[PDB]
Each structure stands twice: as structure tokens, then as C-alpha cells.
Design brief:
The structure is cut from a larger assembly and holds chains A, B, C and D. The termini of chain B are far apart. By secondary structure, chain B is mainly beta. Chain B contains no helices and 16 strands. In chain C, 19% of the residues are buried. Chain C contains 2 helices and 4 strands, in the order ββββαα. By secondary structure, chain C is α+β, with helices and mostly antiparallel strands. Chain C has helices at residues 52-61, 63-73; strands spanning 12-17, 23-28, 32-39, 44-51. Classes of the chains: A alpha/beta, B mainly beta, C alpha+beta, D alpha+beta. Chains A and B meet through helix 4 of A and strand 6 and strand 7 of B. Bound molecules: magnesium ion (10 copies). Chain A binds one RNA strand through strand 1. Chain D: The modification N6-acetyllysine is found at residue 89.
RNA sequence: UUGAGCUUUGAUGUGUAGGAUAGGUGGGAGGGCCGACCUUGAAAUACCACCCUUUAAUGUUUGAUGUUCUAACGUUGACCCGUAAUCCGGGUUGCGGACAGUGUCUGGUGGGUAGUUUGACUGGGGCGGUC
């Protein structure tokens, strides 16, 4: 076994600041292939309360571009204007039939309030249970979709709901500038606490850990 | 939350008296000779669904509440929650067990069912009057010696039990009225 | 009267104050308690009506000292 | 309440000790029965430097005298004749006071508050077993028979 | 006698369908052999991550009643004394016993009681309307 340098360098007792062990994140790795960096975030959420839902999208700059699989629903000339955004399937309910076929390539599903009609009842159990619904608080169903799709496919890391208290989002590739990743990770507070559910509990951001795939264990302070 | 006075509100308003939404169903205003005016309102508790009787004083009054109803469409159930959506705003929404009480067995998928939401949150869902459902279990009816109609107990794909005439077998879709819990027709 | 035989804590008057600042008169009463103290000097049990503060004062200062102080003050125990 | 002990007590410590004890416990039980004195500096010095020998002599002489009294009430038999009905079953329950003054009549000089009988009452005739708490560390037994008079 | 939390050593979630002997949620090719690919549901599977679900060793922070005891306290139980006294106090004794009760603080209830409010216009006032 070669998975034990991690257990040599697990510091659960000495919690680090942002600057301390940030540079060691890949020095803690022995991976065969290349991976991304993950995040650790929490916030008091009544398991019971549903009025605690926050869906949308978080734009995280300075990093990976079009590495996402999107499915779009538009009506009109935007069916061709959207192909200018490098989108994959800008089309009609044939895409819904593709979903019925059990399609796992496309991950983030987009619509337009005119053709949203098609989207809602289509893949209805499927997309939303797939944790990919289309609310309006998030702008996944716009009228000016040209100005948003280039971003949603370009650089967006979406916040998600989980049955557990857990809410752990994703950072970009390991090989980026570690200091800049610190700023990127910092650019998440302004939105993760932009819209609470007003029934927040004892604290706001209890956990802060930066694990890349299974390698890094960097516990951090809620403030710093 | 404009406060409402007794001799002002007629039926339909959603008053918020005592940390609890209500719904005025009927109201009788009285102005007798020589005495303080009052209204005998036939209120409706909007959470348990029981009709309460309240005589209100001209002066006595209450704030309004955000209790509203429109046409949501059922999507799916997961664990303890039911999720529905609008066709004019396409706003997502999630209810709970309390809201769907005894209508669990009536909602299938894509049913357009009126729901009452309060504080921007559902409290009570009303299944469409007639729902088409399929029967999971029945005893193959055999007329035997029956001289009257007889009837037959039949479970449905959503758990419900209805009396179906005799011929409906298994795999036949029937139509039931959610209101009475009774068979209406076997939809071909 | 409700007066601690050791200190002399009397019922003092004050106010009830509501949330709307409505003042109504009231009394504060000293936490009096009849208690038998063991006077080792006299091999006896003497009973003083003391408050709890008086009990603590006796704890600290010794009972015979308090009794001598009472005799000096001219207070029958 | 800091207090200095003048005797071996149950779960605090041997004499000549400095123990933190609850105020109520020190005030109501310990100090009236000589088993403790508040830890005023005057008493600390007065005891340690001046008394912690003499009072120890007194304590050990008392322990020896009580072991002596235990040896002396080793007759192990004392007669009790009280009124009883049929089938034994004394009408009048003989008690601690009766046992004490009877053994003082025929035996040792022992106080009424000393006897400690476990069964509680002694309502019936016959051989009974009674314990005697003569000192906080030593006991005594006597066989008491109740003959129906 | 135990109950909830907290450093904590670990284990552990058993259906449909996937062979079943899937905890959730993202990132998802790691360590003799799996994995992804495929069968699949409502979610699809190695790899560890954030934790839920219980379970067992310590420091845990503790409360919870449940028994015993006597010494505080209660006694409008019996007897003795002050005493020519069904008051009061003292003394023996029995029964309760750290409960009861009282003081400060506090939540609830509180027309039992108290202080008060309850508009103006108006072809008199009221009701209706109006500001
Ligand atoms: Mg005044
Ligand atoms: Mg004070
Ligand atoms: Mg008791
Ligand atoms: Mg109390
Ligand atoms: Mg109060
Ligand atoms: Mg009232
Ligand atoms: Mg009044
Ligand atoms: Mg006014
Ligand atoms: Mg007029
Ligand atoms: Mg009017």
C-alpha cells in the first residue's frame, strides 16, 4: 500500500490557516492520473425545513473553461444563436426523448420560458430527481440566453442541496496557481451567504477543508 | 398585512388571527338598535381544516396573511416530500407530509392540483376531482351465486382501495373521484 | 417584626416596574429563618431569627462574637 | 467551608486535616458534635502546634475504653419478660429503650441511644439478635430472648 | 440506576434492478484484483473525501429519580417544667425529613382589584357614508 503518506501527514489536531498547507496540496498526492480540487462547507439547515432551498449557479472565475455537458431548450432564432455559444444540443423535445432513452452525458439542463413548457413535464421525474431542476431563482431559464450560456458553459460551479447537512462544492484542477485558488475559494462566501433561509442555526460556516481527490486534508478556520 | 376590521371583511379573505391562517367563509353583520355592532363570521381554520364560529366586535380586528392558491402540477415524491410546479412562472416548490394528508393516494404524476400555500409555503393540496388510476390487486370476480350487484375490493397502483363493480380485473385503469373515494368508470 | 437579629435587615420598600414602566409600590423582605445555633462556650442551643446573610456572618465571625455584639446592642436573645 | 477535623470521620479524612466541606454539613452536624472546627488561623495553630498531641491521646484513650466496653458486654445473653399473647406475638413491642435499661440492669452501663437493632421492632417472642454501636468503628452483639410473662 | 453532548478508537446501513452482501453528496480511474464500460433504478457501483445511522474503550460537561440515613427544618402527636394556665417557651419522646415552607429573581393565569380609553363631520343624535 502507498496510501499512507496521507496518514503520515493528517493533522487533525493542528488546524492550518489558508496559507500554511496550501502549497502541499499536490505534494500530498500519489495519483496515477490528473484530478480536480474539492471543498468543504457547511451551514445549519433544518433537515426538516424545505424553505431552506437555494438553487442557482455560482460563477467562479480564472480557470477551466468548457468542460461541462449541457442540454438546452430554446424556441425561435435562438435555436441557432445558441449554437454560436458552442452548445451541444440546442433543439426540441427530441432531446426530451433522448432523456427518456436514459441519457447520462448531458448534466446541466437549461430552458427558456417559452420552451420551458417542453422541459418541465419532460424528464419530469428524471431531471429534478436527478437534482437538476429548473427554478427561476437561478436563471437556468432565461430570455437573453446568449448572455448567460457562454458563462454557464464557460465558468460556473453550481451549489447543490444534499439530504445531509453536507454542502461541499468543487474547485478547479490541481495544477492551477495555489494562491489564486485561495482567492477563488474566498470568492464563495459572498454567495453562499448571499441568500440564507433566515432560520440559520448556531453558526454560518463551520467546516473548511480542501481535499483534491482523496489526497489533501487541509482543515481551516471559519474566519481566516 | 393590512389589518382588517370586522365590519369590513366579507367571505374570501385570509385573516391571520392568533399565529394561525384562517379563511372567512361567511359573515353576518348586525347593527341592532341600541348596541355595539358585531359580525358573526363563519371562519375556517386553514391548517387542520375545521370550521370555527367567531362573533367579532366592530372594533376587534386582525392582520391579513399571505395564504394563496393557484394551479400547481404534481411532479414527483421523494422520501417525505412532494414537489410541484407552475405553468405560468415555472417556480419549483416542495411540500411535506402534513400538507399532503390523504391526498397521497390520489396524486399520480402531472396531475394539476390546486394547492394552498402560506408564507410562500404549501399547507394543503387538493387532488383533481377525478383521477385515472390502475389497479394493482383484485380477486378475479366470479359471479358465483350473487343475485345482487355484489361489488369487489380492489387495491390500486397508489395503495388506495376502491369497490369496483365485478369485471374490472388487473391492469385495467379505472376512474375514481377523489372526493368520494369511489369508482366512476373503467377508462378504456 | 421581620428583622434579622444579627444584621438588622428590615423590609425595604421599592417599586414594581412593568414593561410599560408602570410603577406600583411593593416591599422587599429579608430572607429570615428561625435557626438554633450551637453555642459551644455555653454548651447550649440559642435560637436567633437570622437572615441567610446573618447565617453567613455567623459562619465567618463565630457565634459567641455575634452574641456578645447582640448583648452590647441591648437585644434579648 | 474550610474546616479542621478533631476526629476520624466517615469519608473526609483522619484528624488534623484540612477539608473543604459544605457549609450546612459543617454547621449542623460536625461542629456541634466536636467532630470539626472552622479553619481559622487561630484554631489551626492552636490545634496543630498545641493540641494535636493531647487530643490524640484523648481520642485513643476513648477508643480503648470503648473496646473495653465491647469486651465487657460479652455476656451475650439477657432475659426479657414482657406481656405477650398466644402464638408468641407480643402485644407490646419491646424496644431500644427496654433493651438498653435491661442490659444496664444485668450487664454494662450503656446509654439508651447506643443500641442499634437491625430487625427494627422485636414484636415477637423468642431469640433475637441485636447490635450495639458502642464506638464509630466497633460494634457489639447480644442475644436477647423475649419470654412471655 | 442511568440520558443526552464533547476530543475518541473503530466498526456499520442488508429491498425493486444491478449477480446482491448500493448510506448520502459532490469531485470521480485507484490500489492480489475490482472499477468504469454493461445490465440498472427513483438515484449506478473502484479512490478517498464532507458528514447522517447505530454500535463499543477513556477525559468527558453533566443533569434524573430512586433508595437509605439524621443533624438543619416542620410537628395544630404524647408526657414533664415555668404554673393555681387546652397561650408561649424550655426538656424528654415519637412521626415526618432535606421534602414541606419562607425570601429574591422569573414564566403563566389573573375583571378578584385599580387607573383609563372608547374620534370628528352630520341639515338633532344614532345607523349609513366620509376624512
Ligand atoms: Mg403615579
Ligand atoms: Mg448581600
Ligand atoms: Mg420522613
Ligand atoms: Mg420550594
Ligand atoms: Mg409575570
Ligand atoms: Mg384579562
Ligand atoms: Mg374596570
Ligand atoms: Mg385612540
Ligand atoms: Mg341626522
Ligand atoms: Mg359610522
Amino acid at each position: 500500500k502507498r496510501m499512507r503518506v496521507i496518514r503520515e501527514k493528517v493533522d487533525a489536531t493542528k488546524q492550518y490557516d489558508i496559507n500554511e498547507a496550501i502549497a502541499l496540496l499536490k505534494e500530498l498526492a500519489t495519483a496515477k492520473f490528473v484530478e480536480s480540487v474539492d471543498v468543504a462547507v457547511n451551514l445549519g439547515i433544518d433537515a426538516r425545513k424545505s424553505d431552506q432551498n437555494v438553487r442557482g449557479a455560482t460563477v467562479l472565475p480564472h480557470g477551466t473553461g468548457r468542460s461541462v455537458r449541457v442540454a438546452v431548450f430554446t424556441q425561435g432564432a435562438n435555436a441557432e444563436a445558441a449554437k454560436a455559444a458552442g452548445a451541444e444540443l440546442v433543439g426540441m423535445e427530441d432531446l426530451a426523448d433522448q432523456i427518456k432513452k436514459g441519457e447520462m452525458n448531458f448534466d446541466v439542463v437549461i430552458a427558456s420560458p417559452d420552451a420551458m413548457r417542453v422541459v418541465g413535464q419532460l424528464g419530469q421525474v428524471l431531471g429534478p430527481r436527478g437534482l437538476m431542476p429548473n427554478p427561476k431563482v437561478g436563471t437556468v431559464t432565461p430570455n437573453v440566453a446568449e448572455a448567460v450560456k457562454n458563462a454557464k458553459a464557460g465558468q460556473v460551479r453550481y451549489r447543490n442541496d444534499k439530504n445531509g447537512i453536507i454542502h461541499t462544492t468543487i474547485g478547479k484542477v490541481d495544477f492551477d496557481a495555489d494562491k489564486l485558488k485561495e482567492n477563488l475559494e474566498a470568492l464563495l462566501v459572498a454567495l453562499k451567504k448571499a441568500k440564507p433561509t433566515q432560520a440559520k442555526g448556531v453558526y454560518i460556516k463551520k467546516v473548511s477543508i480542501s481535499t483534491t481527490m482523496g489526497a489533501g486534508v487541509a482543515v481551516d478556520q471559519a474566519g481566516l | 398585512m393590512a389589518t382588517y376590521y370586522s365590519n369590513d371583511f366579507r367571505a374570501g379573505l385570509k385573516i391571520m388571527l392568533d399565529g394561525e391562517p384562517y379563511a372567512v367563509e361567511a359573515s353576518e353583520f348586525v347593527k341592532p338598535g341600541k348596541g355595539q355592532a358585531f359580525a358573526r363570521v363563519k371562519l375556517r381554520r386553514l391548517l387542520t381544516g375545521t370550521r370555527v364560529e367567531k362573533t367579532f366586535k366592530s372594533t376587534d380586528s386582525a392582520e391579513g396573511a399571505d395564504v394563496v392558491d393557484m394551479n400547481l402540477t404534481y411532479l414527483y415524491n421523494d422520501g417525505e416530500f412532494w414537489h410541484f410546479m407552475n405553468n405560468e412562472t415555472f417556480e419549483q416548490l416542495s411540500a411535506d407530509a402534513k400538507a399532503i394528508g390523504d391526498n397521497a393516494k390520489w396524486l399520480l404524476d402531472q396531475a394539476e392540483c390546486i394547492v394552498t400555500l402560506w408564507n410562500g409555503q404549501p399547507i394543503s393540496v387538493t387532488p383533481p376531482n377525478f383521477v385515472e388510476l390502475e389497479i394493482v390487486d383484485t380477486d378475479p370476480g366470479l359471479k358465483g351465486d350473487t343475485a345482487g350487484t355484489g361489488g369487489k375490493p380492489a387495491t390500486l397502483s397508489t395503495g388506495a382501495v376502491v369497490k369496483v363493480p365485478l369485471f374490472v380485473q388487473i391492469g385495467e385503469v379505472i376512474k375514481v373521484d377523489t372526493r368520494s373515494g369511489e369508482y366512476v368508470s373503467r377508462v378504456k | 417584626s421581620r428583622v434579622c437579629q444579627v444584621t438588622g435587615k428590615r423590609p425595604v420598600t421599592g417599586n414594581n416596574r412593568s414593561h410599560a414602566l408602570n410603577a406600583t409600590k411593593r416591599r422587599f423582605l429579608p430572607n429570615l429563618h428561625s435557626h438554633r445555633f450551637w453555642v459551644e462556650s455555653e454548651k447550649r442551643f440559642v435560637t436567633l431569627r437570622v437572615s441567610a446573610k446573618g447565617m453567613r456572618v455567623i459562619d465567618k465571625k463565630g457565634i459567641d462574637t455575634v452574641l456578645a455584639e447582640l448583648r452590647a446592642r441591648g437585644e434579648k436573645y | 467551608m474550610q474546616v479542621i477535623l478533631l476526629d476520624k470521620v466517615a469519608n473526609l479524612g483522619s484528624l488534623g486535616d484540612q477539608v473543604n466541606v459544605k457549609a450546612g454539613y459543617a454547621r449542623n452536624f460536625l461542629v456541634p458534635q466536636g467532630k470539626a472546627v472552622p479553619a481559622t488561623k487561630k484554631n489551626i495553630e492552636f490545634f496543630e502546634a498545641r493540641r494535636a498531641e493531647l487530643e490524640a491521646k484523648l481520642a485513643e484513650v476513648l477508643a480503648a475504653a470503648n473496646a473495653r466496653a465491647e469486651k465487657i458486654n460479652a455476656l451475650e445473653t439477657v432475659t426479657i419478660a414482657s406481656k405477650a399473647g398466644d402464638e408468641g406475638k407480643l402485644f407490646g413491642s419491646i424496644g431500644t429503650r427496654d433493651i438498653a435499661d435491661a442490659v444496664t440492669a444485668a450487664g454494662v452501663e450503656v446509654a439508651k441511644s447506643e443500641v442499634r437493632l437491625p430487625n427494627g421492632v422485636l414484636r415477637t417472642t423468642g431469640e433475637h439478635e441485636v447490635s450495639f454501636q458502642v464506638h464509630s468503628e466497633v460494634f457489639a452483639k447480644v442475644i436477647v430472648n423475649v419470654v412471655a410473662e
